[PDB]
Amino acid sequence: EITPDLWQEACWIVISSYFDEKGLVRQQLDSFDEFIQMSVQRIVEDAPPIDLQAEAQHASGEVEEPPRYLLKFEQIYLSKPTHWERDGAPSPMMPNEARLRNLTYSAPLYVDITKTVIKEGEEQLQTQHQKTFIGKIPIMLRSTYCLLNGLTDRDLCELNECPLDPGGYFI
Amino acid sequence: RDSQITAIEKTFEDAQKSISQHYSKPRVTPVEVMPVFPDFKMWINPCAQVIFDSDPAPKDTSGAAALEMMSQAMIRGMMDEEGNQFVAYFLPVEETLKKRKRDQEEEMDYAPDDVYDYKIAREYNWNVKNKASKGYEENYFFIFREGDGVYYNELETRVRLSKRRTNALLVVKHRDMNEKELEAQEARKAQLEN
Amino acid sequence: PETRIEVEIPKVNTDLGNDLYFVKLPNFLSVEPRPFDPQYYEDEFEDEEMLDEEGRTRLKLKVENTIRWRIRRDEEGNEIKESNARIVKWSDGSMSLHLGNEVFDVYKAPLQGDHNHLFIRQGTGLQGQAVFKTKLTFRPHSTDSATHRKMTLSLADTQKIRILPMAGRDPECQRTEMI
Amino acid sequence: IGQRIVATLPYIKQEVPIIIVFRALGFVSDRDILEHIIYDFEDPEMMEMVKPSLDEAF
Amino acid sequence: LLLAALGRRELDDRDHYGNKRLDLAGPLLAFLFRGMFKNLLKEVRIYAQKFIDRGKDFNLELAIKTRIISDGLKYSLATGNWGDQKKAHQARAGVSQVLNRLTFASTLSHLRRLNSPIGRDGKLAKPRQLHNTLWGMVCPAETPEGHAVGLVKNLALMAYISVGSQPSPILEFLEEWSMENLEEISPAAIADATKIFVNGCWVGIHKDPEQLMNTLRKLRRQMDIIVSEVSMIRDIREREIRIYTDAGRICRPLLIVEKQKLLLKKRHIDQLKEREYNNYSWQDLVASGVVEYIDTLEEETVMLAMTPDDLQEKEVAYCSTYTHCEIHPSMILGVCASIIPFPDHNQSPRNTYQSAMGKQAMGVYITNFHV
Amino acid sequence: PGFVGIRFCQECNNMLYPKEDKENRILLYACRNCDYQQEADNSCIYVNKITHEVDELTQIIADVSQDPTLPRTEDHPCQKCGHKEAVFFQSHSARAEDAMRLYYVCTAPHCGHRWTE
Amino acid sequence: MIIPVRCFTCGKIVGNKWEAYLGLLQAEYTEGDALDALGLKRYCCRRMLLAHVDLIEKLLNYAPLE
Amino acid sequence: TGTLETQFTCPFCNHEKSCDVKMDRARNTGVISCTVCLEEFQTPITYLSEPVDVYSDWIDACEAANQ
Amino acid sequence: AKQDVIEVIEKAHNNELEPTPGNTLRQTFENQVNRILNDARDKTGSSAQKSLSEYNNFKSMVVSGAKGSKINISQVIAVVGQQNVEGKRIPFGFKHRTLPHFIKDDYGPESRGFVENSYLAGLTPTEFFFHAMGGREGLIDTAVKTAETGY
Ligand SMILES: [Zn+2]
Ligand SMILES: [Zn+2]
Ligand SMILES: [Zn+2]
């Protein structure tokens, strides 16, 4: 067991291991990482699915059964933060570039939408638009969806970024 | 597909390379290198992990006596006053400890004319999770045999025991395995090929 | 009064070796008890799906971190059992698991509090075999590897988001479908 | 005569006596309602306090 | 309510941190995104309606107005107004602030800042007072000395905020232990039996709370069913067991004490000292069940030593039943408050003023400052 | 004086109210719904302790003996079973709290004796 | 960022001693014996090498805007 | 959520806020009368009964009678 | 002084403490303890005053009246004293105790905020936090008073 004599060393060894595992901004990163991994998916599928029924125009002179539309948002995909030049050429957007060019460091969000339509008494044939794009979500630096994740000191300095920067903020 | 086979074969080939120095702390050197294999001897026996809510050792016996008794303990399903089943934990009596040691020293599995007595110690409510229950995860145990290798085996059943709320002695006589038990071993052996 | 209950059961004899260790495999380690043979090999139809990199990460671990053994015949036809993994004991008493080129630290921890016992199932009863004294936990060495970064996802293993490979025209994809 | 208990339910423009809320949930008899509140009937001190609410919802 | 009216149970305290949760960047963004996404489906509804009432086919790729999420998120993160721009004057302001890049300690402390939604200019002192419940969770010294004094707080060095996990694994484990489902039990049985609450949902009653608590703690200490964030509080006088798995619970790590002895023995320190060669780390310390994350609501029932080497020997026994031990009592300070040398030799307002000025002191604020 | 409590109707299980038997001049308990009624055994309709003297000891529970954050004394042996270890604490109930009186519970299972000195 | 040329308090040149001090510390010298070896007697001069942090080594990790 | 209604649209002549409720707490009866078409309805009330309960009894009697 | 407070606590726990006029029993107990601890702090400070040499620079700055008071000398040298919030000793923020480090129903000096160390000797962590709680009141009053008095 740890004697009183050694306890002052042991105490700071335990603390140092805590701060090596968890940075100082771990609560931020974790929160955001869990939002992207869970809360966005959950929010989409928990939304009420669209039910549209056309306004009866009565042009046949009778009470018609107007067609109704069904859409269900399904799986969510999120790519890394990307910058497209004005011509659409794709490039990974470096945080530092964003910081200099006044960009917003965000990732595009895509969602599978299965469309379905029920015309009066006739059959419905669900068609689907895979990975349609919904807006961009801003990414918090140094999270798992960031580009600076698990990157070594050589890499960070190569990206003109600071290895000591805690991350945990949005651009 | 073969992009995977080629990589797998590489891991065996890399495993054939002799080791001579530690991957860090350079003054250290390898004392023993052991291949890891499924325990071809033990895989036929369905090993189960029993987790007690509290120390099951009998209060008056400490140290080696407690370990030897518990290592030979037997657990059996019992039926209560209303007929609902529970679990009885039995420990070997002192003669059984002596007999087991005698037969082991005589290299016999059991003496064919002897009966081994175990006394009930406690009643426990039991919760059984096995491979057949949804979301069951496999725990393993590793046996290190010096100069032979490290052989691992699977804990097919996980039993969690909690203190429940008849002073009975379980008298055990050994018998040969029947065809159904042998078939169960062969079926387990089959998990190693085809 | 001592109540006599008589039962007939075969005795299970166990060779517990020198040390018995409890092992809970982390998500980044797995074990295949069948011998690795490319013939009749597992129909690992993961790449058939053309999975994204959360899945190719899973596939990488599936190939690289599985402890496997195989039967190989020498020129005499003798069947030799070979393992792609091996545990090394060091002069300082530490241990590490070497799997081909992968290396993992192995930490020995005594099981305090948990009264975990090894029993063998026999019919409707259980025969005691041993008390687990130490458990082994494994961690990858070579933290400089990107796989170390990615292994965090294996720990995280309800639908979850998927990650696209940054591909596409998207401002133009917006604009073009918009036409 | 005093100490009536009222619940402010969401979307309900007025306070409702809790005993009415329990009857609305389907627990019609006063014994059954009190069983969900006064776990130990051996407690006259606590029961004397619910009487005003049982009275209001009579 | 009856208990409180009879006075058998004390009233609840709004400033006790066991009764508080922190909305971090995750639940904050989920709160926006929920609104925007619901708006996005409002627009797909009105757009498709315009097309389908005419009998034509509405193309959803045109119906999705991409901009609603993109500019929605962006807007509130840019201005700090946490709500739809159409109704900006009704939503919270300053939730998102420009990171303070004047000095590294200001950057670090700004990333570790807590805010109380209490309206400023409020005469009430209680919400601004340093409640005892903040010990080790929130820095007792780092708070602005202006009008925001005590409302704006900062995390202690080892304060962790739970990210949250689903309770289903726990519920399954409870159902397999001897817990009566609330729907099955006879009301008469609730009298002499503890009431178990999971995330505030009363889910059952249990006859033997002592074995249950010992089991639940053993699980958490092995990281299997119960993740280490979960906090089990045993209200003995109340006969209630409350298990929380939700997000936002502020908690901190503590050493475990089973008898008058730490669970942290020299073997752990030795392995920890070598963590460069072998990757032994904090995770192994937690997994070996030597350390534990205690939450404020759980801390009301733990008996905590400050230092083992003096408060576990005795002359005339003071406690003799400690359950946890502080790692190091200086971990109660925050980022700016822990750079102060000898803060325990200073008057506390001086410590507070140094915490405030430590964010205004010049230095190299980041290594890539030339970029 | 005692402390009067609720009485329930055997037919509908609703609460019974006191009624004087206008004829037999005795006390009856009667259901406001069904015509059920029964003869009262107490003759006391209500009581109200103004002093609020309450035997605070009765609300103490034996489970408190295992609280780790509660002080312990070997100096006050259990009056019932003689066990030395006892936990002691004050009556934190608004009317009892003013008195600062101590209450002791035996730290021995299945004894559970609670007393005051 | 870079070792100061002169001790702020007295003026002794200490800009030529950071590399030497690093070399002495590369040997097993205790920083107090290192400081004595470098001839820093007054505490004002010793404060310069004990408290100096060489950030220019970090700033050099970045590729230059040649 | 909000304040409870005290004036109602006569379910017959549909004139808005034309109906008011007189509550005879003594005879345990509520009386509602359209100040436009003079239609009236009366229902037994209790001490819990509010104007909204009388109006409802009127609507329930109308909805039951118009079948 | 600590022994005297302990004796008062024993008398209170045994109900040997008679409630003084106007006050309740719990209030008379708090008054008794505050009296004992105030006597302790004042006496230790006074003993500190007479021990200071004529060249002591605290005394030179206190007897001149330029800056400081004898209470500051007392707190720096002898003992800091009782830490109060809203005029009362530190409240039971947790259930019936001031910090998880103390045992339930502990009305002793260090359990309720009495800082027994001096600023030279340093403050124990529990009474460090209690000193922070006491000093927070000054900051809050400073922030809220300005808006009431300016109006
Ligand atoms: Zn009735
Ligand atoms: Zn006793
Ligand atoms: Zn100098």
Curated annotation (Swiss-Prot), chain B:
Q: Which cysteines are joined by disulfide bonds?
A: none
Q: What subunit structure does UniProt give?
A: Component of the PAF1 complex, which consists of CDC73, PAF1, LEO1, CTR9, RTF1 and SKIC8. The PAF1 complex interacts with PHF5A. Interacts with POLR2A, TCEA1, SKIC3, KMT2A/MLL1, SUPT5H, RNF20 and RNF40. Interacts with UBE2E1. Interacts with PINT87aa which is encoded by the circular form of the long non-coding RNA LINC-PINT; the interaction enhances the binding of the PAF1 complex to target gene promoters and may anchor the complex on target gene promoters, sequentially pausing RNA polymerase II-induced mRNA elongation.
Q: Compositionally biased, Basic and acidic residues: which spans?
A: 182-194
GN (gene name): PAF1
> Where, per UniProt, does this protein localize?
Nucleus
**What's this protein's family per the entry?**
Belongs to the PAF1 family.
* Function statement: Component of the PAF1 complex (PAF1C) which has multiple functions during transcription by RNA polymerase II and is implicated in regulation of development and maintenance of embryonic stem cell pluripotency. PAF1C associates with RNA polymerase II through interaction with POLR2A CTD non-phosphorylated and 'Ser-2'- and 'Ser-5'-phosphorylated forms and is involved in transcriptional elongation, acting both independently and synergistically with TCEA1 and in cooperation with the DSIF complex and HTATSF1. PAF1C is required for transcription of Hox and Wnt target genes.
Annotated segments matching region Interaction with PINT87aa: 1-129
Q: To which species is this protein native?
A: Homo sapiens (Human)
Q: How is this protein named in the record?
A: RNA polymerase II-associated factor 1 homolog
Curated annotation (Swiss-Prot), chain C:
Expression by tissue: Highly expressed in skeletal muscle and heart. Weakly expressed in placenta and liver.
* Compartments where located: Nucleus
According to the lineage, what is the superkingdom?
Eukaryota
Q: What does this protein do?
A: Component of the PAF1 complex (PAF1C) which has multiple functions during transcription by RNA polymerase II and is implicated in regulation of development and maintenance of embryonic stem cell pluripotency. PAF1C associates with RNA polymerase II through interaction with POLR2A CTD non-phosphorylated and 'Ser-2'- and 'Ser-5'-phosphorylated forms and is involved in transcriptional elongation, acting both independently and synergistically with TCEA1 and in cooperation with the DSIF complex and HTATSF1. PAF1C is required for transcription of Hox and Wnt target genes.
Q: Indicate the family of this protein.
A: Belongs to the LEO1 family.
Q: Self-association or partners: how does it assemble? A: Component of the PAF1 complex, which consists of CDC73, PAF1, LEO1, CTR9, RTF1 and SKIC8. The PAF1 complex interacts with PHF5A. Interacts with TCEA1, SUPT5H and CTNNB1. Interacts with SETD5. (Microbial infection) The PAF1 complex interacts with Zika virus French Polynesia 10087PF/2013 non-structural protein 5/NS5. The interaction with viral NS5 proteins may reduce the antiviral immune response by inhibiting the recruitment of the PAF1 complex to interferon-stimulated genes, thus preventing their transcription.
Q: Which organism is it from?
A: Homo sapiens (Human)
Gene (UniProt): LEO1
UniProtKB/Swiss-Prot annotation, chain F:
Q: Which domain of life is it from?
A: Eukaryota
GO cellular component labels: nucleolus; nucleus; RNA polymerase II, core complex
The record places its TFIIS-type zinc fingers at: 74-116
| Coiled coil residues, start to end | none
Give the keywords, sorted. Acetylation, DNA-directed RNA polymerase, Metal-binding, Nucleus, Transcription, Zinc, Zinc-finger
Question: Which Gene3D superfamilies does the protein's record reference?
Answer: 2.20.25.10
The family database entries (InterPro entries) matched by this protein are listed as:
DNA-dir_RNA_pol-M_15_CS, Rpa12/Rpb9/Rpc10/TFS, Zn_ribbon_RPB9, Zn_ribbon_RPB9_C, Znf_TFIIS
Residues annotated for Zn(2+) 1 binding in this entry: 9, 12, 31, 34
C4-type zinc finger segments = 9-34
Positions annotated to bind Zn(2+) 2: 78, 81, 106, 111
Which locations, inside or outside the cell, does it occupy?
Nucleus, Nucleolus
**Which cysteines share a disulfide bond?**
none
Subunit structure, interactors included: Component of the RNA polymerase II (Pol II) complex consisting of 12 subunits.
Protein name listed in UniProt: DNA-directed RNA polymerase II subunit RPB9
From Swiss-Prot, chain H:
Q: Which UniProt keywords apply?
A: Chromosome, DNA damage, DNA repair, Nucleus, Zinc
Quote the annotated effect of residue 39 to A. Does not affect transcription-coupled nucleotide excision repair (TC-NER)
Give the highest taxon in the source lineage. Eukaryota
GO BP terms = transcription elongation by RNA polymerase II; transcription-coupled nucleotide-excision repair
According to the UniProt entry, its GO molecular function terms are: protein-macromolecule adaptor activity; RNA polymerase II complex binding; zinc ion binding
Gene Ontology cellular-component terms for this entry are: chromosome; nucleus; transcription elongation factor complex
Record bears the keyword DNA repair: yes
Q: Where's it found, cell-wise?
A: Nucleus; Chromosome
- The keyword Zinc is annotated on this UniProt entry: yes
Residues that coordinate or bind Zn(2+): 10, 13, 34, 37
Query: Partners and quaternary state?
Result: Associates with RNA polymerase II.
Q: Which family does it belong to?
A: Belongs to the ELOF1 family.
Q: What's this chain's function?
A: Factor involved in transcription-coupled nucleotide excision repair (TC-NER), a mechanism that rapidly removes RNA polymerase II-blocking lesions from the transcribed strand of active genes. Acts as a key adapter required to anchor TC-NER factors to RNA polymerase II: stably positions UVSSA and the DCX(ERCC8) complex (also named CSA complex) on arrested RNA polymerase II, leading to neddylation and activation of the DCX(ERCC8) complex and ubiquitination of RNA polymerase II.
- Mind telling me what this protein is named? Transcription elongation factor 1 homolog
Q: Which organism is it from?
A: Homo sapiens (Human)
Gene designation: ELOF1
Region of the whole protein represented: 17 to 83 of 83
